[PDB]
Amino acid sequence: RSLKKGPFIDLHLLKKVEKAVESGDKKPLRTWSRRSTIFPNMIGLTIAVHNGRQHVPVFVTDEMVGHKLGEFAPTRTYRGHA
Amino acid sequence: AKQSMKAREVKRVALADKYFAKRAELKAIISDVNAASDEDRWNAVLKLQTLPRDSSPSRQRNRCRQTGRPHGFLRKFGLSRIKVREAAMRGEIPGLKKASW
Amino acid sequence: GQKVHPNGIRLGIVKPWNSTWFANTKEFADNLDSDFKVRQYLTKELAKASVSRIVIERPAKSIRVTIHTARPGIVIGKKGEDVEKLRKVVADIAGVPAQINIAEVRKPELDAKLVADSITSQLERRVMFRRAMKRAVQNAMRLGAKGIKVEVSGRLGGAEIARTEWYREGRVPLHTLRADIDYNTSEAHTTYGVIGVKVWIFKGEI
Amino acid sequence: QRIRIRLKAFDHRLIDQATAEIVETAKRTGAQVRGPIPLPTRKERFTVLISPHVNKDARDQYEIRTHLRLVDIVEPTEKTVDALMRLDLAAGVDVQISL
Amino acid sequence: PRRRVIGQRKILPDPKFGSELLAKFVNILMVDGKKSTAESIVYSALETLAQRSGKSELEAFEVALENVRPTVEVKSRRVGGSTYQVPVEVRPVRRNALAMRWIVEAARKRGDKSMALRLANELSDAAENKGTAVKKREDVHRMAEANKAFA
Amino acid sequence: NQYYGTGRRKSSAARVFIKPGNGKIVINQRSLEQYFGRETARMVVRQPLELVDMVEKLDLYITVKGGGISGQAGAIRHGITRALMEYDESLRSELRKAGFVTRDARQVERKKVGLRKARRRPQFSKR
RNA sequence: CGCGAAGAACCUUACCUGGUCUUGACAUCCACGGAAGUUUUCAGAGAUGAGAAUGUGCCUUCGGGAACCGUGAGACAGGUGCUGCAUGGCUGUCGUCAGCUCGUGUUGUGAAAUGUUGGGUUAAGUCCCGCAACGAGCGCAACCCUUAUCCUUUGUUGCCAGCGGUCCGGCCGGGAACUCAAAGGAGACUGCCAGUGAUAAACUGGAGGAAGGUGGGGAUGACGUCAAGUCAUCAUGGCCCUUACGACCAGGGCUACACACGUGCUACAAUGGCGCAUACAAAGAGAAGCGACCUCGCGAGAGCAAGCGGACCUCAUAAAGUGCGUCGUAGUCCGGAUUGGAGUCUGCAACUCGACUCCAUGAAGUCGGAAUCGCUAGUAAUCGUGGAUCAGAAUGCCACGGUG
Ligand SMILES: [K+]
Ligand SMILES: [K+]
Ligand SMILES: [K+]
Ligand SMILES: [K+]
Ligand SMILES: [K+]
Ligand SMILES: [K+]
Ligand SMILES: [K+]
Ligand SMILES: [K+]
Ligand SMILES: [K+]
Ligand SMILES: [Mg+2]
Ligand SMILES: [Mg+2]
Ligand SMILES: [Mg+2]
Ligand SMILES: [Mg+2]
Ligand SMILES: [Mg+2]
Ligand SMILES: [Mg+2]
Ligand SMILES: [Mg+2]
Ligand SMILES: [Mg+2]
Ligand SMILES: [Mg+2]
Ligand SMILES: [Mg+2]
Ligand SMILES: [Mg+2]
Ligand SMILES: [Mg+2]
Ligand SMILES: [Mg+2]
Ligand SMILES: [Mg+2]
Ligand SMILES: [Mg+2]
Ligand SMILES: [Mg+2]
Ligand SMILES: [Mg+2]
Ligand SMILES: [Mg+2]
Ligand SMILES: [Mg+2]
């Protein structure tokens, strides 16, 4: 776990989220920053997170706050062995 | 070892000694415990990403000088485990000799 | 079986290092690197000078290089026209003022590095390896060596299957630490590949 | 007032020559030399894989031996300290001067 | 060894009693190089034995020991396609080591609380010809009589 | 006067000073029982002075460093023996006959390459 | 099969998805234009594109070159692409086993033999005898390092016997005795004695001695064998790609999980668990480093900050042990896996995927089938400590000491 001396979100996405809040809800905001945490300003937005080869869409709700963006986009596919 | 890799390492070293080792204040004396818990700290944290992904000294793999071998490095000589033995044996390394005890 | 290399098994018993400077952990890695570059450069452009040993000393500040060659005229040149060219070009490779000596080997038939590269040169000119091999052995033995063995290996005479032929004669006690055994290796680059040459020369005890 | 100087070399034969030479050089200048003192020698040790590939179990062990000596001059008259600056110390030894 | 005629490493006697037999016993009982713990177990159990069996501290140890020493063992020898248990007489020094080893191994497989209490009870009933240690001796002798034809 | 002796063991080195008097034993400014909590160490230290029965006739001043308790007890016995030599020099044979003169030259063997210990090799499997 | 890898979050990275470049990320050659470097804004995930400040360094023997940047076109670059059955170099293995050969002579039509066999002896083709063989070489042994005893020299940062002082601390004066440091020597040779043995070689035993028969350990790997391994350390013959099999970037992956095997660690308890007190090491490392004392925190750690390129300071309080108390044979006051919560630290960044801390939870496990592995003495077993790699990240590897 990181420190209580600041959470971590990247600039290139912090600009996009704060630019997209006032202009309403639109097509999902496409990103690669799996490592940026989720802020209360994000609630209700739809973000397409990278998973190596696609941008899976996640709709942010109130309960997914404080979690990193990545953990709503699994990178491995597994359906059984037989 | 694929000259492209050698080129990457020299670029990373040159990029590290230009930005950081002087622009390491903003990761030390603003990420410090004080009353700057306002945007003073937050903006430094945000600024540190804008710098190039390199120049971070934690990104140089410390390859061998004569071959660029990424594994089996020895800091005292700067060579890999292969070239040290080869050069030790002809007598290029002062002092060094087979140890038995 | 793999043999221990014969030179450094004797370093500090009967043989001296080729570099005799002192340095702490800070610059040890960087003296070795400069020493590599100067040796790489000298052997690259003294190819026909028959240089057999390049010892490097690093006094308080400067660097001094001693060259052991069998044809000092070519490296000295007229009145020292080109040894100064060496000094000026060494000084910036090492980044420190340089001073080049030139030492001397009397009998090239009794130095392993000179024998080895002589054989490679003939092989690279398509000489029957038996002639080169059997000739170096007899030349060295009639000048007073107490023993010698040479060894070549790898696609000899343009064969399709690599072999290993070694001609030994005299006395070469590799297991005795008192023995003064001069050994050195060289490679020849044939149109059919590469051929390694190894030489052992035994000069006497203690 | 006293000068204290250390000698580091990679071999004991060369450090002996330089030590016995510096020590007598000062004694000529009339001062009294305290030493020499053989300090413990630092022996580094290295182990390296000798195959280019696998066979971890076949290694080779090397070492660097650093010999060390100490001499103290306790009445450095104003002809000794300078004189020491012009001695033919070897190449494989280095000196450390302390006042 | 095929040729070596081995000597014999010396053993220091007991500190308390000066016995060359209890030094072996402590060595047999000790584990993982903890000599002090073994001496504590042997001493405490020995003195408990002394006061239970009257007096005579270390010859109370001898009287139980003499009740468990084997006199003939069996050696398995393969003949030509069958094997026989040829019974062979035991050497003097081997008699003690066998007697001590059996007592200690039996003094481990009990339900008592401590190791001192565990060992003292074995040392007692062995002097009284009871216990797994003396049974081991009976079994070995019984096995070695059934093959007396091969002696 | 005082007579001196150096004895040593696994990794310890003891120096022992013997003086005529009554039985007094001091190890590193402490009494014999205060130092050696292990009772066999006490028996080892006293052994030479019970063989040559000068146990109540000598002061012993002893300084010990290095090693562990059993090594220190071993060194002291060797140091005592050598000093007790320097006292009489005529009671050598019987001190030799008990194995006290011999300086036990056993040392921990160095770990070797490929072995988990001095001699313990890893497990070997055919398949 | 804890192997390359002495350490995969990014990098490493060679693989995948997408976005990008084509004389190129690395080098030489020409032409041309700009001294370089800067210090900043936008777009972009970033590569990269745009743009605004910026400087004009030196000889000019006043034409350029310096060095650096950018553009053009081709010689070429580049390849962790294939072939270890085309090769070099390096390594494993039989095996630290005692063998493997040659010159000359002789025997045989010849391949070949002899020597090198035989009687003894040895760790040994080690040695002595005999002998159509006479000699020699590579191997064995010795020469090298370390350990075990003693002696000479030097005495700080190491030491303290005799002295005096003392705050009881070698801490002060002081001493060079002792431990110790590290240079130079002495010592061990079947050398001496007795017996056996072919008037032999060598064997047993004894003395003396720190050590006795190769004192202990290490380095040292003969001719060759496996077309053994490595074309991904490197070098290299042939073949292949050159708008891509080359180059740059972000994210992922190498950490998947029905299963099977190899090597380890922790346990199943009382020779033990827990709590308090308390002894005794060795070898190492340290400058973008080791970090003391003190204050804060239950803790990991935080704040301030001395000392040290080190026999001086720091890492760093050894643990088994020992004394007292408690538990009382129970899936337990054994076991500490898993999971929830809350944290610290490194690092642009710990979701995939770090280490550690505190609270809580308390799986399997009650000594393990057929079978199988290591070890002959300071060895096995057991207890801790250090180092390399390394921003962080060992139960692995390499070394050190304690009990034994
Ligand atoms: K090869
Ligand atoms: K012949
Ligand atoms: K190739
Ligand atoms: K990844
Ligand atoms: K297992
Ligand atoms: K493990
Ligand atoms: K992580
Ligand atoms: K429990
Ligand atoms: K680390
Ligand atoms: Mg790294
Ligand atoms: Mg150990
Ligand atoms: Mg294996
Ligand atoms: Mg292994
Ligand atoms: Mg990447
Ligand atoms: Mg990666
Ligand atoms: Mg033969
Ligand atoms: Mg024959
Ligand atoms: Mg021989
Ligand atoms: Mg013969
Ligand atoms: Mg040998
Ligand atoms: Mg003295
Ligand atoms: Mg093959
Ligand atoms: Mg390949
Ligand atoms: Mg892997
Ligand atoms: Mg610490
Ligand atoms: Mg139970
Ligand atoms: Mg344990
Ligand atoms: Mg460790």
UniProtKB/Swiss-Prot annotation, chain B:
Which GO molecular function, any one, fits this protein according to its record? tRNA binding
Q: Where is the organism placed in the taxonomic lineage, from the top?
A: Bacteria, Pseudomonadati, Pseudomonadota, Gammaproteobacteria, Enterobacterales
Tree of life domain: Bacteria
Give the gene symbol.
Answer: rpsN
Q: Does the keyword rRNA-binding apply?
A: no
The record's subunit annotation is: Part of the 30S ribosomal subunit. Contacts proteins S3 and S10.
PANTHER family named in the record: 30S RIBOSOMAL PROTEIN S14, SMALL RIBOSOMAL SUBUNIT PROTEIN US14M
Q: Which family does it belong to?
A: Belongs to the universal ribosomal protein uS14 family.
Tagged with keyword Ribosomal protein? yes
- Main function: Binds 16S rRNA, required for the assembly of 30S particles and may also be responsible for determining the conformation of the 16S rRNA at the A site.
Which Pfam family, an example, fits this chain?
Ribosomal_S14
GO terms for biological process, alphabetical: cytoplasmic translation; ribosomal small subunit assembly; translation
Question: What is the protein's name according to its record?
Answer: Small ribosomal subunit protein uS14
UniProtKB/Swiss-Prot annotation, chain C:
List the Pfam families.
Answer: KH_2, Ribosomal_S3_C
Q: Which domain of life is it from?
A: Bacteria
The entry's keywords = Ribonucleoprotein, Ribosomal protein, RNA-binding, rRNA-binding
Sorted alphabetically, which SMART domains does this protein's record hold?
Answer: KH
GO-annotated biological processes: cytoplasmic translation; ribosomal small subunit assembly
Tell me its family.
Answer: Belongs to the universal ribosomal protein uS3 family.
Listed under subunit, the entry gives: Part of the 30S ribosomal subunit. Forms a tight complex with proteins uS10 and uS14. With proteins uS4 and uS5 encircles the mRNA as it enters the ribosome, which may play a role in mRNA helicase processivity. Some nascent polypeptide chains are able to cross-link to this protein in situ. In collided ribosomes contacts ribosome rescue factor SmrB.
Q: What is this protein called?
A: Small ribosomal subunit protein uS3
UniProtKB/Swiss-Prot annotation, chain E:
Here the disulfide bonds are: none
A GO molecular function assigned to this protein is: structural constituent of ribosome
User: What keywords are assigned to this protein?
Assistant: Ribonucleoprotein, Ribosomal protein, RNA-binding, rRNA-binding, tRNA-binding
Q: Which residues form a coiled coil?
A: none
Which GO terms are recorded in the biological process aspect for this UniProt protein? cytoplasmic translation; negative regulation of translation; ribosomal small subunit assembly; translation
Please give the GO cellular component terms listed in this UniProt entry.
cytoplasm; cytosol; cytosolic small ribosomal subunit; membrane; ribosome
Q: What does the protein in this record do?
A: One of the primary rRNA binding proteins, it binds directly to 16S rRNA where it nucleates assembly of the head domain of the 30S subunit. Is located at the subunit interface close to the decoding center, where it has been shown to contact mRNA. Has been shown to contact tRNA in both the P and E sites; it probably blocks exit of the E site tRNA. Protein S7 is also a translational repressor protein; it regulates the expression of the str operon members to different degrees by binding to its mRNA.
Miscellaneous section: The strain K12 sequence is shown. Has been predicted to contact the N-terminal domain of IF-3 based on footprint studies; exactly how IF-3 interacts with the 30S subunit is controversial.
- Assembly state and interactors? Part of the 30S ribosomal subunit. Contacts proteins S9 and S11. Cross-links to IF3 and the P and E site tRNAs.
Q: Which family does it belong to?
A: Belongs to the universal ribosomal protein uS7 family.
Record's protein name? Small ribosomal subunit protein uS7
Origin species:
Escherichia coli (strain K12)
Parent sequence residues shown: 2 to 152 of 179
UniProtKB/Swiss-Prot annotation, chain F:
* Family (UniProt): Belongs to the universal ribosomal protein uS9 family.
Q: Which GO terms describe its molecular function?
A: RNA binding; structural constituent of ribosome; tRNA binding
GO cellular component terms attached to this protein's record: cytoplasm; cytosol; cytosolic small ribosomal subunit
GO terms (BP aspect): cytoplasmic translation
Please describe what this protein does: The C-terminal tail plays a role in the affinity of the 30S P site for different tRNAs. Mutations that decrease this affinity are suppressed in the 70S ribosome.
| Pfam families membership | Ribosomal_S9
Q: How does it assemble?
A: Part of the 30S ribosomal subunit. Contacts 16S rRNA. Cross-links to the P site tRNA and weakly to the A site tRNA.
Enumerate the SUPFAM superfamilies for this protein. Ribosomal protein S5 domain 2-like
InterPro entries according to UniProt: Ribosomal_Su5_D2-typ_SF (IPR020568), Ribosomal_uS9 (IPR000754), Ribosomal_uS9_bac/plastid (IPR023035), Ribosomal_uS9_CS (IPR020574), Ribsml_uS5_D2-typ_fold_subgr (IPR014721)
PANTHER family, alphabetically?
A: RIBOSOMAL PROTEIN S9, SMALL RIBOSOMAL SUBUNIT PROTEIN US9M
The UniProt entry, under Gene3D superfamilies, shows: 3.30.230.10
Keywords (alphabetical) are:
Ribonucleoprotein, Ribosomal protein, RNA-binding, tRNA-binding
Which regions form coiled coils?
none
Q: Report the protein name in the record.
A: Small ribosomal subunit protein uS9
